Design a protein around this ligand. Structure first.
Ligand code: BAH
Ligand code: CA
Ligand code: MG
Ligand code: ZN
Ligand code: ZN
Ligand code: ZN
Length: 223
């Protein structure tokens, strides 16, 4: 996350860290047994880490659980990143508390203008590499699809939306990947892609989760 701030320990209780021997992506807990993340974060051998803040220090509120199954969206296009969402099932159900909580899926999609919270342990330098050990937050509004499409002509579909600052400076970045974008209490986006990070006129692109609620509910009930 570039131009963000330190969230604070366990202030984003639904945030997860996907670890395959090191943190590689983020994700969101949707109930005690399932996590939603991005399909471009797909790997085999994933361990989910809940209650994290400093991912390099066992501070006491973590739960480390292995994934029993991963389901990448059936129409995921790795070339365009259209339908960039995946579901991970845990081997054991997590114990939810103040520090580990699930986030609610939306009833409707959110409007442009709406401010959201995005978080992750991803890169924090636009030009450089600096990876943080504690969770970083960023508040950004959803941009109109018009400015999104102008920034990325012929690359945006109806399953994506942009959020950010066209002036540059603030953005999610690699590592934040799969992470949450919460606006008004609902999970509305998944950190998917961008052009570099925090570049002017190159806002972040997010998966539009409100278009996947029936797939998510049907998939978790039958698995
Ligand atoms: N080595 C790894 N473990 C790793 C993990 C995830 C990655 N994801 C990318 C990316 O290439 O897929 C990537 N994810 C992005 C998310 C947001 C923005 C943005 N808003 N500018 C840009 C991004 N680029 N590389 C990655 C490398
Ligand atoms: Ca920790
Ligand atoms: Mg994240
Ligand atoms: Zn990359
Ligand atoms: Zn990238
Ligand atoms: Zn990524």
């Amino acid at each position: 996350i570039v131009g963000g701030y330190t969230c604070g320990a366990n202030t984003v209780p639904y945030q997860v860290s996907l670890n395959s021997g090191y943190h590689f992506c983020g994700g969101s807990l949707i109930n005690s047994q399932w996590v939603v993340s991005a399909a471009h974060c797909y790997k085999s051998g994933i361990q989910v880490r809940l209650g994290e803040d400093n991912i390099n220090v066992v501070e006491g509120n973590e739960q480390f659980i292995s994934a029993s199954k991963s389901i990448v969206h059936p129409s995921y296009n790795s070339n365009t990143l259209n339908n960039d969402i995946m579901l991970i099932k845990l081997k054991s159900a997590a114990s939810l508390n103040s520090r580990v909580a699930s986030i609610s899926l939306p009833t409707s999609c959110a409007s442009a203008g709406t401010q959201c919270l995005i978080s992750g342990w991803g890169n924090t330098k636009s030009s450089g590499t600096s990876y943080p050990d504690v969770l970083k937050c960023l508040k950004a509004p959803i941009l109109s699809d018009s400015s999104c499409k102008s920034a990325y002509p012929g690359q945006i579909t109806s399953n994506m939306f942009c959020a950010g600052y066209l002036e540059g400076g603030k953005d999610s970045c690699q590592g934040d990947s799969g992470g949450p974008v919460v606006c008004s209490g609902k999970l509305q986006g998944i950190v998917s892609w961008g052009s570099g990070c925090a570049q002017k006129n190159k806002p972040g692109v997010y998966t539009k989760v409100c278009n996947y609620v029936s797939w998510i509910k049907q998939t978790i009930a039958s698995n």
